[PDB]
Amino acid sequence: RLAELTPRDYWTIEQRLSVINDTIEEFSTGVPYDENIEIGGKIRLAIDRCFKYDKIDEIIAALKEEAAEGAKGGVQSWAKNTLEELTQRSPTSLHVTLRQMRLGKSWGIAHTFKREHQMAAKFMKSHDFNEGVTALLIDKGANGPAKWKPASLDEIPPGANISEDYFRNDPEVPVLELLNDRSYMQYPYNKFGLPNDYDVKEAIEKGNFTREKLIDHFVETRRGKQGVREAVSDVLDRMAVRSKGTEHVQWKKE
């Protein structure tokens, strides 16, 4: 079908994407009937309550609370499992990784790649990378678990910032030269997917929809995209309060 589509030379880039989006939805067989949203409801709320800080120490501290029996969230099992996996990875990567998640929200796509090049260039000289790779993929898991230069996050003292070192491009490595100059701050056309919180929020701030009338709005605008009713319902179960009864719906943040 994609081959049959023959657009006109004067159609804007938006039109071409619209035609394909409507064509890919013609082959939708429907999402499973039993599988529920994995990261949703409680688990989703827990992620927003334990991954909002700028220090790994604070993040793990929050997870321990959720793991501790009797937590209001009810995500104790997930919390416990998550910690087991977080205490099995290179602590340097965690600090460095989380560091760019807060800094990558303001960079441009072009600037990101240029920084990642210099960023990854210092990982080749790092000890964790050369050790983890050799001890996992190369050895095929033989010789037991890998041995990071810092054994655990506890070893790294609080007042020590190891993230900063990587985020300093050296003059030895030339700046990455991209094939073009195109760039932007946010994705030009990333709206094809299921409505996220940003979409539901925007709709509420420009309308007076109800709990049930708001879902139909998105189901109508997308004209039957599979999973819209379920996705939008989940968003209204985490950041939507019955402020004025069934008449109106507002966000919990306020």
Partner: protein, 253 residues
């Protein structure tokens, strides 16, 4: 979880595989009475009949449903044609939703190519953005020639081929339910499915009816905001030019 008259009281927006399989939309005709041309939709052979692929039906149905919606969104005149003993309620209902015309009897040969004679006395009217009459076109509704459907939605192409030929002969798009023994080259947009089933025909027609309904809704919503999604037809456009000419004389004289 199933009522016989459920495809009329409340037809679904989209038809899933279960709905199509539950409505016998895959029971093709006997293996012998097949058309090798449309072997692109057949899934296999069971019980001596060709099994139409369920996915192939859903894909083409959603595509046709998008065609009906846009044509109704651009102020197009749709025609729902089902000519069989028990297809009268199905077609009339679909027309109501899409605000279209119905046809449940033998299509009189020559109603599109020879419309001047057949549809000579039937009355017309002139509407505007919000689909309301416009006083002042009395003189235009007597020299104007009859209308032709901007889109035909047939439910039994095998039976009436004289209608579909006039559509291709008059450059009009068409939608039809192609069975295992129906030539898929007669209609513009095919919907491979079982046409001999009054339960599948009600489903397919219902989905297309909702498409038109949804299309008409958007059009009227865009007309209340001063955004017309269609420009004056060429026929009525010529009348405006003549109107100014006749009016110009009054100005001078």
């Amino acid at each position: 979880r199933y009522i016989p008259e459920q495809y009329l009281r409340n037809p679904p927006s989209d038809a899933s595989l279960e709905d199509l399989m539950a409505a016998q939309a895959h029971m093709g005709h006997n293996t012998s009475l097949w058309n090798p041309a449309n072997a692109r939709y057949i899934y296999g052979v069971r019980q001596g009949i060709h099994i139409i692929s369920l996915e192939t039906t859903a894909t083409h149905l959603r595509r046709a449903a998008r065609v009906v919606e846009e044509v109704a969104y651009r102020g197009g005149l749709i025609l729902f044609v089902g000519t069989r003993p028990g297809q009268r309620p199905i077609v009339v209902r679909a027309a109501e939703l899409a605000k279209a015309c119905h046809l449940f009897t033998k299509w009189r040969p020559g109603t599109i190519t020879n419309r001047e004679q057949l549809l000579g006395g039937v009355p017309l009217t002139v509407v505007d953005e919000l689909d309301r009459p416009l006083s002042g076109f009395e003189d235009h509704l007597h020299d104007r020639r009859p209308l032709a459907p901007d889109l035909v939605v047939c439910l039994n192409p095998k039976e009436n081929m004289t209608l579909l030929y006039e559509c291709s002969l008059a450059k009009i798009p068409t939608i039809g339910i192609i069975d295992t023994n129906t030539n898929p080259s007669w209609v513009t947009y095919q919907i491979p499915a079982n046409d001999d089933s009054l339960r599948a025909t009600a489903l397919i027609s219902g989905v297309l009816g909702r498409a038109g309904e949804r299309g008409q809704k958007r059009r009227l919503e865009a007309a209340q905001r001063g955004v017309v999604t269609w420009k004056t037809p060429a026929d009525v456009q010529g009348y405006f030019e003549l109107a100014s000419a006749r009016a110009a004389d009054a100005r001078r004289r």
